[PDB]
Design a protein around this ligand. Structure first.
Ligand SMILES: [Mn+2]
Ligand SMILES: [Mn+2]
Ligand code: NA
Length: 122
């Protein structure tokens, strides 16, 4: 029984647009929390690696858990509202700003559904 945790960054600007990356299907920047890192350190590291920004002000937006045989997975969704730098496709992946109003849960993997609903509201 091992744990696998992933930190996810929801980057929102002043115009209520979120930075979305692509694979085909759309998704949020993010990745695995490594040994010895806190959830906060991991989201900062993964975002610096994937989109070239350093989160400065962020809060826990949602935490989802998945219990599978021999594996406990936790997804940490952080709402990033202020950062240093400009988001871009640093790891060579497609990226772009999309307004919250126009976000469609069907364009993201089913796992993000509850977060999108919550996001696409307030
Ligand atoms: Mn990554
Ligand atoms: Mn990684
Ligand atoms: Na990623």
């Amino acid at each position: 029984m091992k744990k696998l945790q992933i930190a996810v960054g929801i980057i929102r600007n002043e115009n209520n647009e979120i930075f979305i990356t692509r694979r085909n299907k759309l998704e949020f920047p993010g990745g695995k929390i490594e040994m010895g890192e806190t959830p906060e350190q991991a989201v900062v590291r993964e975002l610096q690696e994937e989109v070239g920004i350093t989160p400065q002000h962020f809060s826990l937006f949602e935490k989802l858990e998945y219990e599978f045989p021999d594996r406990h997975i936790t997804l940490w969704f952080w709402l990033v509202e202020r950062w240093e730098g400009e988001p871009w496709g640093k790891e060579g992946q497609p990226g772009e700003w999309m307004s919250l109003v126009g976000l469609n849960a069907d364009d993201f993997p089913p796992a993000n559904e509850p977060v999108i609903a919550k996001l696409k509201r307030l």
